[PDB]
Design a binder for this molecule. Structure first.
Ligand code: HEM
Ligand SMILES: CC1(C)[C@@H]2CC[C@@]1(C)C(=O)C2
Ligand SMILES: [K+]
Ligand SMILES: [K+]
Length: 405
């Protein structure tokens, strides 16, 4: 299902990669995307899939483009174009300098200070979920930990009821890995109709939750509007429910297959942060992009005003030009080069929360359940989109080899 090749695109640059269903998905999603970095593929290519768009395949190009917001605007950051145009989240649908005052407020609510605020709840919940699973000797990790652990901490941070998780998660999934059951526009308006009354309630009677803080915050000297508060809160939801949730499954799938990597962390837990970095590199999972604000020649390639370009955050750290043996997980890498949390002005505002959830998960899981594996004969299926994911991760273990703390 290819869109007609636009007249300005040389055919030697054509490579029909489908970011929502890559040909090589069975081998793993990161492997499926890494075909873009084989010798037969140029640095910057055009796919006719999903409406037609560019893809930069090298970390150097991806970083350069994310840095140069003048040519590569965030106004339409999603593929396909209908999704990008509908996408109005704050601050991600804005360029500098407009982005600035909204970013400060985002950081107030999901940045470092809030991690330090919630540290104990994060630790408490991980221990609680894991201890509860430990004597079963089995679990479906996606639904049993990967989802409830980060999502409940986010609902806690946002003061929203856990009753709304299955609903919210669904709409959020629709914006990252669409079912086809609803357009991006449908999903957004569903999420907005959920948020709107809550925000109004909380502008009238301010709480201490993230939503109250955003909705009563200040930008450009004035009160934030109800619409703006909604557009920021919408993004916070997506980040809360469809990032770390997916990442945790990739990591745990890997660890289920590598006993030596597990023991490495169990014996020297001070290496856990560096290991988190490496896993974030190897199992990077995000791919959005930008839109050309004008005709622009970029590394020898003529880009036209209005062209969309996908700038896969996932690819930079997999680029062999940035990391030798990129598909190998190596906790001792002197430098873990990646752009897993993005690059430029829109660098992830929630990355400290994310790292915290990852590091707590690694430590607390391996403490109690050091020895586990994927269920016998189970086939693990990855899914691809703006944020990549795992359909299910059946794990098994002998409870005799586990340990309560
Ligand atoms: C493994 C976990 C995560 C990954 C890989 C990730 C990745 C990213 C990336 C690549 C961007 C930049 C998008 C762009 O440049 O267009 C971004 C932005 C953002 N993310 Fe994260 N994210 C994660 C977790 C979270 C969490 C838990 C939150 C909490 C709500 C969050 C909140 C945000 C916000 C608010 C922005 C916008 C910052 C701005 O536009 O100035 N993220 N994220
Ligand atoms: C691309 C992202 C990972 C980043 C945070 C959530 C996400 C889906 C966005 O809309 C911005
Ligand atoms: K390439
Ligand atoms: K838009």
């Amino acid at each position: 299902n290819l869109a007609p090749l636009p007249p300005h695109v040389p055919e030697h640059l054509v490579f029909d990669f489908d970011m929502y269903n890559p040909s090589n998905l069975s081998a793993g999603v990161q492997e499926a995307w890494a075909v873009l970095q084989e010798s037969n593929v140029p640095d910057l290519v055009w796919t006719r899939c999903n409406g037609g768009h560019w893809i930069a395949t090298r970390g150097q190009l991806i970083r350069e483009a994310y840095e140069d917001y003048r040519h590569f605007s965030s106004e339409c950051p999603f593929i396909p174009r209908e999704a990008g145009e509908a996408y109005d989240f704050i601050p991600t649908s804005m360029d500098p300098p407009e982005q600035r005052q909204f970013r400060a407020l985002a950081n107030q609510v999901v940045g470092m200070p809030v991690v330090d605020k919630l540290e104990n709840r994060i630790q408490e919940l991980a221990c609680s979920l894991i201890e509860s699973l430990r004597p079963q000797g089995q679990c479906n990790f996606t639904e049993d930990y990967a989802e409830p652990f980060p999502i409940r901490i986010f609902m806690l941070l946002a003061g929203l009821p856990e009753e709304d998780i299955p609903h919210l998660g669904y709409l959020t999934n629709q914006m990252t890995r669409p079912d086809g059951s609803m357009t991006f526009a449908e999903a957004k308006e569903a999420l907005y109709d959920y948020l709107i009354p809550i925000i109004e309630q909380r502008r009238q009677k301010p709480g201490t939750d993230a939503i109250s803080i955003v909705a009563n915050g200040q930008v450009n000297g004035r009160p934030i509007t109800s619409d703006e508060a909604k557009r920021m809160c919408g993004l916070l939801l997506v980040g809360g429910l469809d990032t770390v949730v997916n990442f945790l499954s990739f990591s745990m799938e890997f660890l289920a297959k590598s006993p030596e990597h597990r023991q490495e962390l169990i014996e020297r837990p001070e290496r856990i942060p560096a290991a988190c970095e490496e896993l974030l590199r190897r199992f990077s999972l995000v791919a959005d992009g930008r839109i050309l604000t004008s005709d622009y020649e970029f590394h020898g390639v003529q880009l036209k005003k209005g062209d969309q370009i996908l700038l896969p955050q996932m690819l930079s750290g997999l680029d062999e030009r940035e990391n030798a043996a990129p598909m190998h997980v190596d906790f001792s890498r002197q430098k873990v080069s990646h752009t897993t949390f993005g690059h430029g002005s829109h660098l992830c505002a929630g990355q400290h929360l994310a790292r915290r959830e990852i590091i707590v998960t690694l430590k607390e899981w391996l403490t109690r359940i050091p020895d586990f594996s994927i269920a016998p004969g189970a086939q693990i299926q990855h899914k691809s989109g703006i944020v990549s994911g795992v359909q299910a991760l059946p794990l098994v273990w002998d409870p005799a080899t586990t340990k309560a703390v």
